[PDB]
Design a protein around this motif. Structure first.
Motif, PDB file in Angstrom:
ATOM      1  N   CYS A  18      -7.653   2.387  -0.593  1.00 44.00           N
ATOM      2  CA  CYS A  18      -6.580   1.639  -1.233  1.00 44.00           C
ATOM      3  C   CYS A  18      -6.789   0.131  -1.080  1.00 44.00           C
ATOM      4  O   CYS A  18      -6.663  -0.604  -2.055  1.00 44.00           O
ATOM      5  N   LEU A  56      -6.071   5.057   2.725  1.00 46.35           N
ATOM      6  CA  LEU A  56      -5.608   3.673   2.601  1.00 46.35           C
ATOM      7  C   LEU A  56      -6.750   2.661   2.676  1.00 46.35           C
ATOM      8  O   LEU A  56      -6.623   1.527   2.205  1.00 46.35           O
ATOM      9  N   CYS A  74      -0.382   6.232   2.626  1.00 42.49           N
ATOM     10  CA  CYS A  74      -1.191   7.395   2.656  1.00 42.49           C
ATOM     11  C   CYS A  74      -1.224   7.874   4.089  1.00 42.49           C
ATOM     12  O   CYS A  74      -1.283   7.053   5.020  1.00 42.49           O
ATOM     13  N   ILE A  99       0.848  -1.157   0.000  1.00 46.97           N
ATOM     14  CA  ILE A  99       0.000   0.000   0.000  1.00 46.97           C
ATOM     15  C   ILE A  99       0.889   1.213   0.000  1.00 46.97           C
ATOM     16  O   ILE A  99       1.771   1.330   0.872  1.00 46.97           O
ATOM     17  N   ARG A 118      -7.414  -2.752  -3.814  1.00 48.44           N
ATOM     18  CA  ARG A 118      -6.626  -3.995  -3.836  1.00 48.44           C
ATOM     19  C   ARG A 118      -7.519  -5.170  -4.131  1.00 48.44           C
ATOM     20  O   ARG A 118      -7.154  -6.056  -4.874  1.00 48.44           O
TER      21      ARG A 118
END
Length: 205
Positions: free
Chosen positions: A176, A173, A167, A164, A180
């Motif tokens: 994020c 995140l 952030c 990651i 993913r």
């Protein structure tokens, strides 16, 4: 008055066109046969079943505050009047769900992600706020958060192979991790909670 209330002359006439187009495209009527002073119910002869999709589309297309009620859509000019009563934008962009995410979906990612960072860095999970900067406010070091990502993916049954990009906000995140899922495991993750498949795998949350 009635002289360039918001937009220029042509633009305001194309405004008519923008609403006219909706009446036409949905019903199969020719937009050139749509007259502004034509009372929809009477002269055009549109009834509620069709008219309702139009009122709906008008509200959605121009992104109005309040949804136009089908009993409040009487005539084309009357609808135009109603359009501008809330919100109207010439050459409005119908921005779709480019990201396509739900707060319920990133939520469960968000739960575990905070737990690992908390456990690893010695902080409290509930004290880790999404509006709070991780490094700046939460006091977590880059190594502390980055190193925890790996075991986090492991605990999340995700590819720890992927990293990651750190952030500084937990909100970032969280999005994020949600990305993913799509990039590593496919859109399948959300598909489970959306369209429930035959085997007991409905729980995608």
């Amino acid at each position: 008055g009635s002289h360039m209330n918001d937009v220029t002359t042509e633009t305001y006439e194309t405004l008519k066109q923008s609403v006219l187009h909706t009446f036409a495209q949905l019903t199969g009527y020719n937009v050139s046969e749509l007259s502004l002073t034509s009372h929809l119910e009477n002269d055009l002869g549109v009834d509620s079943i069709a008219l309702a999709e139009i009122a709906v589309s008008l509200s959605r297309q121009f992104q109005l505050n309040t949804p136009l009620l089908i009993q409040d859509i009487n005539t084309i000019k009357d609808a135009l009047d109603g359009i501008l009563q809330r919100e109207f934008q010439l050459s409005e962009k119908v921005e779709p769900a480019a990201i396509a995410l739900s707060g319920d979906a990133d939520l469960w990612l968000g739960n575990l992600v905070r737990q690992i960072f908390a456990s690893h860095s010695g902080y409290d999970v509930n004290a880790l706020a999404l509006d709070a900067e991780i490094e700046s406010d939460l006091g977590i070091d880059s190594v502390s958060v980055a190193s925890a990502q790996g075991e986090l993916f492991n605990t999340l049954q995700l590819n720890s192979e992927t990293i990651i990009a750190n952030c500084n906000t937990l909100s970032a995140l969280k999005q994020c991790l949600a990305a993913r899922l799509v990039q590593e495991k496919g859109q399948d993750w959300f598909e489970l909670t959306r369209a429930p498949p035959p085997p007991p795998l409905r729980s995608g949350c």
